[PDB]
Target: thioredoxin
Amino acid sequence: SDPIVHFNGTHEALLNRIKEAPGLVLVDFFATWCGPCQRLGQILPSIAEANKDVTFIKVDVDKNGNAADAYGVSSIPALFFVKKEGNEIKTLDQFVGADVSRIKADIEKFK
Model:
């Protein structure tokens, strides 16, 4: 089955979904017309399939503008490695760009 979470909802809905995850979360804010986003989107499913302990959440900024804007996203693709910490979300790493190698390195380092 498709392991990628294709998120649709409000900023609060996004925060709650992140807090539902059992472990590490990667949130990818993207647009469909963005080249780096497209190239990252082609390889994310493979990374997700190999790392079922990590929740991969994709947030299309055009359909979830309020969520993205409220999360503080400007440039894309905007990546955030986060984890639930009590009733709060801890951010472990964040960056803009299709840095596949950093994505992989962050996954390996965090677990």
The CA atoms of residues 29 and 37 lie 9 Å apart. The two ends are 23 Å apart (CA to CA). The domain at 1-111 is CATH 3.40.30.10 (Glutaredoxin). The longest strand covers residues 88-96.
